[model samples]
Target chain A: APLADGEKLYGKKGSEGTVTFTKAIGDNAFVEIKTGADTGFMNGCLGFSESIDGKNYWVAYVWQTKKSDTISIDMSSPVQIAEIIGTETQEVTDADTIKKLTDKIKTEKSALLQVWYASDKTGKQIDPADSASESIEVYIPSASADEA
Target chain B: GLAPLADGEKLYGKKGSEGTVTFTKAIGDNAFVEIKTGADTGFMNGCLGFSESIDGKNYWVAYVWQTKKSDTISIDMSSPVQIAEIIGTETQEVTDADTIKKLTDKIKTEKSALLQVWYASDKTGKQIDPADSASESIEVYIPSASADEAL
Candidate 1:
């Protein structure tokens, strides 16, 4: 089930979610967003705002999963929902868009948000505490630009 | 000499008590260590030096905090009182830079450090270590570097 017109996720200020790399499927991988499940928001919009060289690039995908199980984002081939590059404006649903970047999240308790801090190129969960950035590659799950 | 205690902050480690300290809570980048001083010693101000084991064999940096005129004290183990700062001199800084760097690198790589508050009655203008006192050692979590950066 997709999100309603004005529904949003991750409303609490400073609220964060964890990303754990379960296993890899070919060149792609499975990254589980650890959060509770709801029947209505199963097939909802999921966004990944990645930080590269101090600039943030936004990418969104229509995530699909079971309501009772974990929301494992399929990185093999993500169908694009939206894309924005270094812009403050978010014109996702026309009248529903706003000027503030965070406004793109919209509404309340209908979406999820987490910080993609650091990861190994192996698509495995790298401990931010011990792993050195030079020893591993930064992983950012994204949707193909051609599809968006 | 040490910094003055803030409002409502009490002193730890009474005059004749020989017990271990307790980690109360962490406030921002700093943390509080309560010595569980049973009764007031009627003293105005004092110092307590302590050590913590980083690994099974070696210990982490030697730390010291001031005890104000109260029953229990909240030692501020902020970055301002790191190993280098605690052992370093005012003019020349750390006499053993290599040793300090090794310990600092160990703490940074392991993502954990310790704060074991023991007993040291005479901790003024002196380098304090774990062997400096014979009081029991209590463990506490030292905040990580990235955690500090996140804040």
Candidate 2:
């Protein structure tokens, strides 16, 4: 099902979703999702989950690039998962926007590092003690899909 | 026979026995001559000299601090008294303001995320229910004087 506005799918339910690589479809080479029109207010976790040894794990990642509206997830990984982007109803303050932007960048980078770790047979879970243990470099698109 | 000289008079000794008698003048003064063995001698004041009385009696008087030897006849009128000595070294004072300034500037320039761990009411900025009340720990490299020296 297409993601509705203000709705997020994660945890157990998020484990069941389609995986798409944006680069293979002529989109950005990153895992991402743009908010659709039906949702009035955006909310929920936007992330990908994978099964390792029959155990499923999910990560909640989202980015608020615009001030008043707009949420997205970058799809730059080979194993792209269709995850729901989370949203909140509160007024998007400048501080909140900045926080979301930085958090999204960090999360994207983290996901990339996760991919690398998966490729290397290393653990996917991020360790707080080690900053570079599962770190990825995420690049934000200068122009949105509409602008481009 | 020679008569004893007056109180302030410089007594002139007999020609043949002058030097010997003058040298043996103070044979009985108790204040000048001290007899001690092994232990430290107490402080004395003024110079050490011999005084001869009109009756031919000699006395020993000390003018300043001194110590006598135990086994041999050693007189010390100019020796230093022992005092307490320092035991260990001390740390040097810190004085590198430039290093601290550089570290502070670097933190400001970097786009680092500051996450709040504690729950607090947005209005008062105080801790509230469901809000974690711990300030986010920031990993900052504060340059100290020691760091400046290394650079």
Candidate 3:
């Protein structure tokens, strides 16, 4: 679901099964990943996004699970990897089909070699910047504490 | 995560912590692998495995997530994994293959998140005290995840 100035500007499922929503719109896209039970870190997850405006984000809560924050949604997949896995003649014999498929998988691996190694695209262990992920809207009855 | 459960503090799965937890299989873009804590920064950070074999049929909602904590004696999750447990009237919803299959095609609605883990059959509202026994015939809920907020 895309097309910003003739380019698919939204998002798509990656070849490796990660949901990738490009932040080409709204300045951010939230990413939530839940691993299976066996994984050491089960439940939900968060990844800070938006390398713009000098910002990054994260969120965690115990009272109520399933949480979201103003953290700029981020997806670090190689931008053009999907583009390179393009179309070809629809009809093909088995032998030629094999060659075409192999050549295609080779596209992403070849493109993303140390892809984020280009300084700006990479990140560090701690947030070089951070923010408040918990948004609590608390309310109480109007009665006074001792006047109940 | 294991702190409160050790300090004589109840972290859900008690004898009557209703509304504190729930479950459902409400819809798609949803349904499994949704294990979230009901308490924000809560210490209920572990897993409770459950399984059963009734007659020759087998049912298991293994790897259950403790939705609420008890430092304040209560809390609830938002939705989805919030209530994956089916109420007793939903026995068919969990045990009947045809009924469950029907659920997949029907409209999925949002209820309290605690709906998933709380069984309507717990009758008088029972919370499974995880510290008591290692196993039991966990008849609480199989899996529904509707977000059924307790009444």
Candidate 3, backbone clash total: 49
Residue range A27-71, candidate 2, lDDT tens digits = 232323332222221112233332223222222233322112333
lDDT, candidate 1, B99-151, per-residue tens: 55554444333322223222222223221222122223222333333444544
What are the TM-scores, per candidate, against the unseen true structure?
A: 0.22, 0.16, 0.16
Off by over 4 Å in 3: A1-148, B1-17, B20-28, B31-96, B115-151
* Best of the two (1, 3) by lDDT: 1
Per-model i-RMS in Å? 24.2, 42.8, 24.0
Error of 3 at B118 (Å): 8.0
Error of 1 at B30 (Å): 4.3
Scored on chain A only, each candidate's TM-score is: 0.29, 0.23, 0.20
Alpha-carbon lDDT, every model: 0.27, 0.22, 0.21
| lDDT per residue as tens, model 1, A37-127 | 2111122223333222333333333333322333444433333212222112122333222123233222112222222122233323332
Docking class of 1: incorrect
The CAPRI-style docking tier of model 3 reads: incorrect
* Cα RMSD for candidates in order: 24.4, 41.6, 23.8
